[PDB]
């Protein structure tokens, strides 16, 4: 079962957290969007039944946790995360309070587009939404103009025998009311100050990670 995250109790701590995100979003000429935005690809193109060999369905209970988390972010109760710059990684995301195992961290957001319209895109943060048999139907999330914390989260080096030991969250795709949705979930208990890491190549192997720390 998905768990709702625990926002920091001090309002000044939540402001400092939102501040680090606003700052990193600014340096990237980005606006804040905690939703998928649909020009490029219409909302009507996002159908989970189009996924090759199907897409797991998010349960009523888990949709309720997702909606609760979404309502928390809307009122100022962001997850306890800090966007911190790193000499070796660029912008990174660290836990700024405890994050229990199975906790919903965030949804991977940005403009939804057809993979075909982004074949020559330099965005270091593109994420697959829908993988259909028809390549003209495959979708991707593009946080180049608007996004949230998800795009700043680090990935593991898939080439080294020990970089999997750094992984503390997992990216998953679930069908939510018939649409593909991309979520980040803590795979273990994460302490204050731990940097967040997931596998950028959880399904396809379309992300070069050989030079990652």
């Amino acid at each position: 079962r998905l768990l709702p995250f625990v926002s920091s109790e001090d309002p000044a701590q939540r402001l400092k957290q939102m501040g680090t995100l606003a700052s990193a979003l600014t340096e990237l000429q980005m606006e804040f969007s905690d939703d998928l935005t649909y020009g490029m690809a219409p909302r009507s193109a996002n159908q989970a039944r189009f996924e090759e060999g199907g897409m797991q369905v998010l349960t009523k209970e888990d949709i309720e946790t997702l909606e609760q988390c979404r309502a928390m972010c809307k009122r100022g109760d962001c997850p306890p995360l800090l966007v911190v710059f790193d000499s070796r990684e660029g912008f990174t995301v660290e836990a700024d309070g405890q994050i229990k195992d199975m906790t919903f961290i965030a949804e991977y957001t940005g403009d939804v587009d057809y993979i075909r319209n982004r074949e020559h895109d330099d965005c270091d943060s593109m994420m697959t939404l829908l993988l259909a048999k028809d390549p003209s139907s495959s979708l991707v999330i593009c946080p180049d103009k608007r996004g949230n914390i998800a795009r700043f989260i680090s990935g593991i080096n898939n080439h080294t025998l020990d970089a999997k030991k750094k992984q503390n969250c997992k990216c998953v795709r679930y069908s939510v009311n018939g649409e593909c949705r991309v979520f980040l979930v803590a795979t273990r208990d994460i302490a204050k100050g731990e940097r967040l890491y997931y596998d950028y190549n959880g399904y396809e192997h379309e992300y070069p990670t050989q030079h990652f720390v």
């Binding site: 996924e51 797991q56 997992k170 795979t187 379309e206 992300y207």
Partner: peptide
């Protein structure tokens, strides 16, 4: 070539 991240659609968390 574009380099985007990928996540599974089966197997849960």
């Amino acid at each position: 070539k574009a380099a985007r991240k990928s996540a599974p659609a089966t197997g849960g968390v």
